């Protein structure tokens, strides 16, 4: 019973299909992992009866298997090394549950729809960092990072940079000093905002990703936004949560991202990677690693998580398929098959 910390990633260079869960009626799945177990979280099918539930990863989500953590139309989960944090929203209120007990709450700031990262959150020591957001998807939507300690909200972090619209952030650790997040951006652009959160200084900054590979959906053709790294290109309306994990090697940080194949519908799902660099100021295209999901199959939301091995962490990306969950992980080397 000791706090988790970011650790260097398990050796490997590629991703492969790891596990598929394909049948309760659930939506918007995610996975979160503690020191020795992974849980598959989803919301049980906006509506007062919606709930945040979980089953052990590898189980089929059924009523017999599922534990109901809290009422919620949206939510997240974390593990700080001593216990699980369950977070969710049902104006709107955000509730935080630690282990068995309800602890703090947070009220919509925008007095508008409140949502959180639909993903595992990121804990260092006993401090869990959660992205929350509100103001409506149709316009300006501001995100904040809540620093949660044993279920209590101790600090609210207001970001600088491009903050007019940040939603559904997929976060992971780049290093022991920082959390980075690949965010959704409705209304304004095909480029995902990228958040850098300094955990030593509890300071966040957001800039638009510079890469010419557009990651949100719908998107214009890659390389087709003749503007400075910061500009908003076409097809801003719509959008979807992207997968994103870090590969922390002793000397380099790899960054893995998901994208749909469709520039229109949410169809298929591809995997992209870049090693090293600094996305806020780096226009180079991401390398294509392979196809996680075929174009004839649904491919909606995707998320990152990391599996804890005994002495390293394994980056993994999950994909929602309207909904079944496919898991891909950084195991070994070679092409994704």
């Amino acid at each position, epitope marked *: 019973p000791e706090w988790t910390y970011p650790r260097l990633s398990c050796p490997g260079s590629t991703f492969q299909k790891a596990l598929l869960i394909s049948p309760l009626i659930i939506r918007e799945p995610f996975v979160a992992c503690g020191p020795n177990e992974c849980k598959h979280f989803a919301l049980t099918h906006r509506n007062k009866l919606r709930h945040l539930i979980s089953v052990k990863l590898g189980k089929i989500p059924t009523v017999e298997n599922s534990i109901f953590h809290m009422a919620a139309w949206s939510g997240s989960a974390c593990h700080d090394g001593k216990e699980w944090t369950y977070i969710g929203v049902d104006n709107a209120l955000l509730k935080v549950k630690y282990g068995e007990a309800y602890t703090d709450t947070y009220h919509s700031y925008a007095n508008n729809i409140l949502r959180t990262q639909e993903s595992a959150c990121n804990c260092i020591g006993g401090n869990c960092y959660l992205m929350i957001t509100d103001g409506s998807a149709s316009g300006v939507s501001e995100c904040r990072f809540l620093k949660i300690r044993e279920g209590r909200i101790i600090k609210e972090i207001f970001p*600088t*940079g491009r903050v007019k619209h940040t939603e559904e952030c997929t976060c992971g650790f780049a290093s022991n000093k920082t959390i980075e997040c690949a965010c959704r951006d409705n209304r304004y652009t095909a480029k995902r905002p990228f958040v850098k959160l300094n955990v030593e200084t509890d300071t966040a900054e957001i800039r638009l990703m510079c890469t010419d590979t557009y990651l949100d959906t719908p998107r214009p053709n890659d390389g087709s*936004i003749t503007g*400075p790294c910061e500009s908003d290109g076409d097809k801003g309306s719509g959008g979807i949560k992207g997968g994103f994990v870090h590969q922390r090697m002793k000397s380099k940080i790899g960054r893995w991202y998901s994208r749909t194949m469709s520039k229109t519908e949410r169809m298929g799902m591809g995997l992209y990677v870049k090693y090293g660099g600094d996305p806020w100021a780096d226009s180079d295209a991401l390398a294509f690693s392979g196809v996680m999901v075929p174009m004839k199959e649904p491919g909606w939301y995707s998320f990152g998580f990391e599996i804890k091995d005994k002495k390293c962490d394994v980056p993994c990306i999950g994909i929602e398929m309207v909904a079944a969950t496919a898991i891909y992980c950084l195991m070994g080397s070679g092409q994704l098959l």
Partner: antibody
Amino acid sequence: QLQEAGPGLVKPSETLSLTCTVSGGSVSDTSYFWGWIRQPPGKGLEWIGSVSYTGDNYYNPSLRSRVAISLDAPKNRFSLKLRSVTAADTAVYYCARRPTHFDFWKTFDYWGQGSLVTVSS
Amino acid sequence: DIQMTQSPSTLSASVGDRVTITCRASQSISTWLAWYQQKPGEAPKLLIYKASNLESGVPSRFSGSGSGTEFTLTISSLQPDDFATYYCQQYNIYSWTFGQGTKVEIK
């Protein structure tokens, strides 16, 4: 369209507060960034920062510990606040406006006149 | 940040002469390099947008071009009204940094 006003003198450790009045346009317009450029005597230009009505805000990282910019839409104006002014901060402070037109293709099309601020005991 | 250098820092040129000013970025800035004309006592006036394009109202004597790291501004015919200090900045990644600029003296 842009005009600076405020103290022409602060002493070390004091906060400098300069306000740029906007006319012939509006700070409430989401298509523009408003901001400040510094020019120390005998030197070239240093960018300080810029803000938008949409909430976006950027600052020069070497300064972004001591600076805040406020877009005061109700009075159609904006201001620069610099804490702990020490000495090397003596400069002409200019306000400027940057449209995000076409696709963010422009850099400060409109400029103010500038206000020279001396830092002294 | 991206450090930008301008050269020559001081320029002596005649009326009717041709002026070339070069900006050297330490990192690629794609094609987003802006140029300004600062007459002493005045706020800098924008001349150039995306390396070229040319700001409306600029006398057509001015034109820029370039890509990546090395860019130039030229004045097709130098006139006394072109006496100014000229500056350029990265206009891609944030922390827009200006070089020292150049002084253009007209003789």
